[PDB]
Amino acid sequence: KQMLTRKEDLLTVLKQISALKYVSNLYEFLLATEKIVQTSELDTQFQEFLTTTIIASEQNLVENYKQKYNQPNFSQLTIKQVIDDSIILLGNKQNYVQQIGTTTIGFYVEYENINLSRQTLYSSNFRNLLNIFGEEDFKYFLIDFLVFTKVEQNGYLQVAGVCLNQYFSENQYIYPEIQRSQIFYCNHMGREPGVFKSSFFNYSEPQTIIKKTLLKEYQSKNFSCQEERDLFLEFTEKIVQNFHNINFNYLLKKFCKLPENYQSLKSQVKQIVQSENKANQQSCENLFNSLYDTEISYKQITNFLRQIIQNCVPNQLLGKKNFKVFLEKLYEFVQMKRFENQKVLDYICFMDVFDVEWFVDLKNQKFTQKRKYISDKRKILGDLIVFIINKIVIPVLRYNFYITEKHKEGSQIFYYRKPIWKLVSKLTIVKLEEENLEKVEEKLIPEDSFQKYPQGKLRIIPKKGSFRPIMTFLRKDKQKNIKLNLNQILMDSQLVFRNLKDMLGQKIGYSVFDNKQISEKFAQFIEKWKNKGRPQLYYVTLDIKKCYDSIDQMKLLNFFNQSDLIQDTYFINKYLLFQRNKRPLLQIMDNINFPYYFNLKERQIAYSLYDDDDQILQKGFKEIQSDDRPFIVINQDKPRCITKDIIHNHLKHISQYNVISFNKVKFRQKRGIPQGLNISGVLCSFYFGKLEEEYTQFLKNAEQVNGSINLLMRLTDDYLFISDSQQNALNLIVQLQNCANNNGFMFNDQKITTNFQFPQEDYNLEHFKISVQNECQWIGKSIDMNTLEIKSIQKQTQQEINQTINVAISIKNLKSQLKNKLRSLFLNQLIDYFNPNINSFEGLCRQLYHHSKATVMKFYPFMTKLFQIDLKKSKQYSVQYGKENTNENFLKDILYYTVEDVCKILCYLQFEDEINSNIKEIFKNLYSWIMWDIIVSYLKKKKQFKGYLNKLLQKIRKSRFFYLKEGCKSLQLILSQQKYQLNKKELEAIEFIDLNNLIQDIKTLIPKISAK
Amino acid sequence: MKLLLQNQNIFQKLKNTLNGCIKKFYDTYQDLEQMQKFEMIVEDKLLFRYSCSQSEMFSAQIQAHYLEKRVLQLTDGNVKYIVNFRDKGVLDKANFFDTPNNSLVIIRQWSYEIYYTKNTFQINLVIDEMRCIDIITTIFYCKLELDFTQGIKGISKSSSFSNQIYEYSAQYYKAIQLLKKLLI
Amino acid sequence: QITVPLNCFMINQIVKAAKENPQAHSGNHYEWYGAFENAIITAKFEFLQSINDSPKIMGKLSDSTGCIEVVIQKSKMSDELPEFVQAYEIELQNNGNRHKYVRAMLKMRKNAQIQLLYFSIVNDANEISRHGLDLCLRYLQRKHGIE
Amino acid sequence: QEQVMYPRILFEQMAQFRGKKVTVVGNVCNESLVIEFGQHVVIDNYRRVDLNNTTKFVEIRGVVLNQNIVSCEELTEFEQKDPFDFDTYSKLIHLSQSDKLSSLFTDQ
Amino acid sequence: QRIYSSIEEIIQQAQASEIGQKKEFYVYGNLVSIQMKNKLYYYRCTCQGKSVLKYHGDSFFCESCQQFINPQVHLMLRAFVQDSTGTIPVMIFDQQSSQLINQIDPSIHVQEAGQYVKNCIENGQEEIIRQLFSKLDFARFIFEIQFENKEFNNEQEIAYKVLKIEKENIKEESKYLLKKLEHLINN
Amino acid sequence: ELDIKESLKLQMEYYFCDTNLTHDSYLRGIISKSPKNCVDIKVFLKFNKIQQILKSKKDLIHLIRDSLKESKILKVKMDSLKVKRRFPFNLNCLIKIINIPQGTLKAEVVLAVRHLGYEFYCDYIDGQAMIRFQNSDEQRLAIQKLLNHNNNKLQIEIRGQICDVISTIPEDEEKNYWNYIKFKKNEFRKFFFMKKQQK
RNA sequence: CCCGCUUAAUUCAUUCAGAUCUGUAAUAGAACUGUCAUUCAACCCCAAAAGUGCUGAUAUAACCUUCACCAAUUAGGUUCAAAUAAGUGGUAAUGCGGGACAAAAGACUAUCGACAUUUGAUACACUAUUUAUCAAUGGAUGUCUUAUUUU
DNA sequence: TTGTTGGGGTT
Ligand SMILES: [Zn+2]
User: Selecting from 3.40.50.300, 2.40.50.140, 2.40.10.220, 3.40.190.100, what CATH number does the domain D11-105 have?
Assistant: First the structure.
């Protein structure tokens, strides 16, 4: 079948598009159109540019540009004037490449912005092409065609024609959406509980004021006649009266009440706030835990919500049975995770329309066209549901509770009462005002900073022993005319620092910033390790505590103003980039557009006016590709200037007057950079790279002074050091603690999670707590020091995993969303460390096994959310899949096709293109079989999946098994001809295939994998 | 395209390279052998050519050139500079697209120059390198100019209309005074 | 960079003086008290039956003080005619070869024939008078501009 | 190709020139073609009724005879819905006759 | 009676003025090259509705009047005004743009302009709008143009907006040029 | 009681065998209609001989469960309220419409009449449309808007055209219509006679 | 399992701010009023347009089996069908009443253009709609009999 | 009288 390739030429990918009828290199376009003859003479530069240029055209026009010999091709007009004439011919058409940063006036073009693709347009090669074509053919070649020119190794740059940005693009009733996320993060609390004093339940208080305050629901355009509106207003007045007779005190008291010892905790907190001296430690910890273990549970609050609705809304407003279905769905409305939401169709699809009482029909359209009546009363049931939810359920959950998620549990929800949260607020404003932050008045801040920069905001998330803060900056002041929040202001500086970050891996210390560089360092170290002969290895792990708040303005600004890796003047360019996604080349149905092969991305960059030998001045872009597959670039006219002076002012501001708000009390940080700024993640690594580099001269040479292989990686915090010489790791720990002693930071929980054993008294580190393990667990990793291979750590219980999957499904376009969803979960982590240099074959199989087992459990909630929607009553899927048992077959379809996609991706990520195709076929079938075996053995025991679907899935797995067997049986006869000379990797794969006896049965391989 | 040029803050580069120039000059010529200084002081001959540093490469737009009297015009927003250049070899180096006018170029390396005129010195400017980075054709109305070829008269014009240009005129006056104080 | 309204006699005189005194700076701009390349003129546009020119559609402009040879264009992908000549063909053909003056903006370049860009049909005598005055005025607006 | 110069003059210049090829531009007369200038009229060679319907105007280039008689070599008309001015046209003619502007209209 | 002026005089008297001045002149130029690359409309209410709340599904509701309204489409274009001397980049507002589209095609009403352009841009019929604009090139008029020296994003800028657009009368343009040139020869 | 427990066990073993529950089959329908053939304990509480041997609900529930826990065909575990046997033991007013646009389909006139709100039967043919009702009061119910005093015309709108209708049919035509109806009815009768006999 | 009917009681507490009152030694106590703001943290990385080799083998496999819900552990049958089983862990239950057509049937000249489907086409609808008409098609619906409260 | 979804890691 059509596997994937790791080297292509854009000629093919343009030939295999639909909307294009002609594509070729300009050399053949000239030979065909007879503008030149083969035996002509042109220097190698001009001939090469003629050779690798590409042109495309929607219609074959080799005839229109045939050379009529009537008029000589002798040119006198400059290239600027010919191109002026071209844009002039374009008239009023408004989207072309040569028409970037230029506006026409009458019969005169006017350039007014910077387009760094011109330097290829007004080149000397284009002057030669104008000499060859003559103007009357040029000024039309620059319109009828699409011109790409190879400017990088493979990445073409479009210079003329239409921009591909234009190949990448009756009304109905869209039901409203219930504002769930308004309930989450409140901090208000009044004397007598209830709902807010601005809500209409308490507006200055018959039906008159209800009309005055319900201007958005009473006179909506769904209510046909005045009678419907007035009856609804009557029901709203009845709702209000029936709600104002509730003893919220008692009502809360019954189901979800404060703990039995709440007064003890209030007293303890009041004591810890009164005392002037620095209070205890374990008392505060146990106070935090006793406060966080008082959170209401879903069932109790659900009973509360039912009991508060049953006596605030008349019965016949929804009907006898619709009301009950509503009250039953309300529970699932409560227990949903943070990033989910419930749709009005979920409520409606299980309701009856005639069941309500107060309807009225103008033209008696109920019996003739019943379907129109059903639709035009669903469009009222929906509004009533949304009114009830967004005007009782949401304000109650806002005022009367506090809703958050804990730190380590994941993405679940959590309901704490209100006074308990005011308590934790006071206790944290006390525990906080002593470590880093400090209260501040308004005049302690200057006025320029006051009128230029935005304020801050702080949120608290409960953790196990203590709290955890998180700073938000999204606000922008309404007055003083500021239109940008802090990150929108620092984006330019962050671009400068990105261009700097592209160099810290080898220049001024020890850092990494992604999985590509980490995998690179691993490739190099593992190469050295297999070189010397694979000895015993040791490691060590440790991590700074509160890094972003231990760094001082002085050394930061001093390193910044005294480092030459930041030039003085920088320009900024914006462009669009088009790459090749994973879809294989569809071998040639009649609708194959660009988005089927190319991903669009809208990038920026910051280049230097110097003659840096990367010449971002001539190309316009700087990109890093992983393999030779073509890509396109087009520039844009939106450049800007930036200078180290303004970056200095920015750093000084964000490191001096960082003012953040909390509970209408203004705080100011004392030393450190705020956590939660786009610039911070690079500043921190830069600063600590300075220090760690000045302290670790012994690393650079210890490979040649005594010959000991050893690497040191370091993300923002979590160090990691692997070596063969124990003494190196020991001295490293000592030197790092020395740097911490001298410069003023300290390590978190002293968790020097080393591998060996050593007396920690000989080095004044006795307070450290060694924790000896045998599998180096870095940031979500399982580096195994027996083969030095990598993999990931996966949660292993269905609840553990369920707490981190937010399902959000809508019947609109299932086959798309779900598809990508599952696909994403297969590549979210496997794509990175599947590199074949790190792992052996069996390691690859193990990684695939484990990650498939994890992604099945991550997906499963999606399947059980699907099976709760009936795919019979919808034509879109029933017309194609059938009318009975449509669900299981739809599911079988998406599973099989996503497995084929992921199998292709893995099959090419493991090999080059030079290998035989029978090996790629075998391993194709093997990965597909492993994934299907996992999915079957996990699915053969569920309830909804046991009767029908298991037959199909079993058949599919048996098919894949037989196909594997067929391939591995045929390959030996294929090699019997000697017709292929086996290279090294191929021989290794063949030994992997024969040793494990893939001919008869896969049994020999599962023991070799399933053990974790 | 006003902001991209304006935010260069060229006056900083000019002030810093002039400080470098005066410092290097009255640091290199403190012999004060008054006879040798009298032999050095000759009319209309170059005494000192200070090539600016590397980080001071401002980029601006040509509004008008004259080739025989070696006059080039530059501008950025509100200020328009009148400068000189080495020779036509320069323009042959900076690969212009259509015409010397209406083009926006960066400046790889320029230089200050010290001349002796009637009764006093002269601080001249000479652009030694250029490269055209783009075309732009816009009718910029720079309210104020400054000439680096007409002495204190070339700068003191319009000095009362900008704190920046006022302080630059002040630095220029101080520089010529320190020059005539050292060497005379 | 700027247009100048002047009559065919002035065009002939300028092209004569320039093509007979080639010792000017090699700027394709002509020189009449400055650099110009576009012009405006009102005159009697009539066709001229040339010999089988598919790329070009030549014309002619007679006026009170001379006669020049203008040149037009045509879409190459399909040799139809633009609006500004479609309308003139329609109206001239209807009213029976009864020609009218036209107000035309045209782009003149040396070492090639004088392109024409656009024209509109005039239906009022005062136009000429206006145009006349215009030239006169603009004349001074360059003469005193050079002194 | 070939320069057929046909200047613009006034009606007194019609007698002042005493034989020359010129252009005269005015309005037609209602009653062998005769046209009004300014009052006063003048006869021509073209047929009174040959001219088209919608037109109310006239311009002719041709040789002028003694007076009240002019030869017509070329004739052009158009539909003017406005009262054609004469004072400003007279000013343009006179200032064309001037010395400071002579180099604009004709050579020499 | 009025006093007219050319383009270059306006450009001068506007590029040499203090920030905040607003003043109008009268020119005999001509419009050209109506821009199309930016958005061609904005939304308004009858009583100077500041903002009409944006919904999808084509629903709308106002707060400067406290009723449910059909939102109104005001269209503002960008074009250039020329003369025998110079070029001015001008903006054009609802009434004047409607007047233009009416003068080119009398089919559309005084209130149907914005409706027509919105329907043509949404339905997928822009070629008719494109040619409708293109047939406005070099339409001679008589302009009353306002200039104002404001400042935006804490940097100085200059803008020109259109106030009046009438049809011309050559009999007055000629008299204007006549008095101009007579005064000129008079010195 | 333990004696009561043995008595209940014996009585339930007697009343749980399908041998008696087939020729009697009083509760057999309930047992088959049960959730999993596992009827609750209160299903025996509707009896008679248990109450006289009895002399709360959960108390008697636990008592019956204890008495059943010793059975051999029944089953009791996990305090299940239901208990089941572990053996299967299987085995005069109508009008006419005219002036109709010739070529009018059925649904249009059907709904143009159905707008009235009450059922009817219509038979259309080219022009002539016989409409009949089911209740005798329907005439004067609907007359005020079929005899539209707004127009005083018996008008029905269909597909863009007005057609007339009658207020009362001559009773000779009505008799012919009733014979038509009884004729269709005997048609159906004889149709199904032949179908009963064709085999 | 399905269906109908049915769920109460003074406050567990009262941040922040203001104004009072009583006493007070710098604390305490009592009564009262006002009250969400633009609600969404950022960075790095990865994916992101409208088709099966419809699927022949590895009994050393695949299925099936148990009284609330679901999930993780034991035993017995089974060779493309089905058979009754045993532990453990986590979610879930106030009470009242109701549950012999049960099918191989015959008889019903009982009902029936207003029966009842199942296919088509036409209409109004659609984001997961419970319809109308016509056409063809023939059976459809309720009772008695193989029937006795220890039900 | 203008300028749309929610994975993985780190804090
Ligand atoms: Zn309003």
Answer: 2.40.50.140
CA distances from D72 to A358, A414, D25, D63, E42 (A): 93, 103, 12, 7, 60
Cα F187 from Cα F179, distance rounded (Å): 12
Q: Calculate how far, in angstroms, residue E57's C-alpha sits from the geometric centre of ligand 1.
A: 20
> Do A684 and A512 contact (CB within 8 A), yes or no?
no
> Quick one: which of A854, A955, A838, A938 has its CA closest to A896?
A955
- Which value in Å is the resolution of this experimental model? 3.8
Strand G lies under 7 A from the Cβ of residue A198: yes
The answer to whether the C-beta of A251 is closer than 7 A to strand G is no
Domain boundary among E74, E94, E128: E74
Residues of E in contact with B3 (CB under 8 A): 155
CA dist list (Å): A733 to A540, A709, A728, A751 = 8, 17, 9, 12
Chain C residue with minimal CA distance to A140?
Answer: C76
DSSP E25-67: EEE--EEE----SS---EEE-TT--S-BPP-SSS---BSSSSS
Q: Which of A440, A458, A442, A462 is nearest to A450 (CA)?
A: A442
- For E68, the 3-state DSSP assignment is coil
Q: Measure the CA–CA gap between A143 and A97, rounded to whole angstroms.
A: 10
Q: Which CATH number describes the domain made up of A500-551+672-790?
A: 3.30.70.270
What would be the CATH architecture of the domain defined by B2-183?
Beta Barrel (2.40)
CATH class entry, domain A194-258+298-399: mainly alpha
Positions on chain G within 7 A of a protein C-beta: 1, 5, 8-17, 33-36, 38-53, 55-58, 60, 62-64, 67-68, 70-72, 84-85, 87, 91-93, 95-102, 109-110, 112-114, 122-134, 138-140, 147-151
Please, which residues 112-171 of chain E have a Cβ atom closer than 8 Å to chain B?
155
Which residue is closest, via its CA, to the C1' of G80? Answer: A951
Neighbours of chain B (3+ CB pairs under 8 A): A, E
- Measure E53 CA to ligand 1 centroid, in angstroms: 11
Residue nearest to nucleotide G100 (CA to C1'): F26
Whole-number Å distance between alpha carbons of A608 and A624: 18
Tokens of B141: 């109305």
Domain chopping of chain A, boundaries = 1-169+572-643, 194-258+298-399, 500-551+672-790, 798-1010
Please state, in angstroms and rounded to a whole number, the distance separating the CA atoms of residues A381 and A323: 11
Q: Which chains touch C (3 or more CB pairs under 8 A)?
A: A, D, E
Q: What totals of helices (H) and strands (E) does chain D contain, helices first?
A: 3, 5
Q: Phi and psi (nearest 5°) for A60? A: -70, 110
**In terms of domains, do E65 and E127 share one?**
no
How far the first Cα of chain A sits from its last, in Å, is: 34
Structure tokens at A242: 């029936």
Candidates A265, A271, A210, A198; CA nearest to A237 is: A210
Cβ atoms of A395 and A195 closer than 8 Å:
yes
| Residue A901 marked ligand-binding | no
Helix (H, G, I), strand (E, B) or coil at A224: coil
